[PDB]
């Protein structure tokens, strides 16, 4: 079941943004990426314990 939250573009791949706002965006996106990489690896490992135990 997919999210309904639409995320738009705040960087620019062709003409680079200002450096101090280009580092706040880059620090924030790596922080959130650590959260969704932790939650994905936790959920898959937890539901593998539940799948094995229910069968």
């Amino acid at each position: 079941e997919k999210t309904n939250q639409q995320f738009e573009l705040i960087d620019n791949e062709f003409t680079e943004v200002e450096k101090q706002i280009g580092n706040v965006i880059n620090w924030t996106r790596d922080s959130i990426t650590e959260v969704w990489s932790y939650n994905a690896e936790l959920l898959v490992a937890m539901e593998n314990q539940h799948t094995i135990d229910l069968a």
Partner: protein, 161 residues
């Protein structure tokens, strides 16, 4: 974008400023901006003031340009001698600009630059352009249409999936 004409009139100055960088059936300029000059070279430039009122029920994207000429013998050729100024005001905005001639590197064959600025005029507001030179005047104000999303890509567009 929904372009809406401003209806500016210009008394005693030239308007057909063109350049060799913008090739459109010869020498032309931007399609929605005017290059206000003097009547001939090294002539004077009168002090002007033009106004626009946003009558619609939506914010209006106003855009004007400031010409930074390549030399001090180039700024005086097209807007006369003296110190120039462009003043822009609104009910939520106030700034002012001054041209700064000087040589720099050749881009597209020229060493002059045009700085484009912008504001969003609120409904039933008024913008005012006091100028006496180096002003790339707007012609048509712009209005937004609705909601969309913009992407940057390098692959081809498909209308099947």
């Amino acid at each position: 974008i929904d372009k809406e004409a401003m209806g500016f009139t210009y008394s005693g100055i030239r308007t057909n400023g063109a350049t060799s960088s913008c090739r459109r059936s010869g020498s032309s300029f931007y399609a929605e901006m005017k290059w206000l000059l003097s009547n001939t070279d090294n002539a004077a430039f009168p002090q002007m003031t033009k106004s626009y009122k946003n009558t619609r029920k939506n914010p209006a994207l106003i855009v004007w340009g400031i010409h930074h000429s390549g030399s001090t013998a180039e700024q005086t050729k097209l807007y006369g001698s003296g110190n120039k100024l462009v003043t822009v005001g609104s009910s939520n905005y106030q700034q002012s600009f001054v041209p700064s001639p000087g040589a720099r590197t050749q881009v597209n064959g020229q060493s002059g630059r045009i700085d484009f600025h912008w504001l969003m005029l609120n409904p039933n507001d008024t913008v005012t352009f006091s100028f006496n030179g180096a002003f790339i005047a707007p012609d048509r104000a712009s209005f937004l249409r609705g909601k969309s999303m913009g992407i940057q890509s390098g692959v081809q567009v498909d209308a099947d999936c």
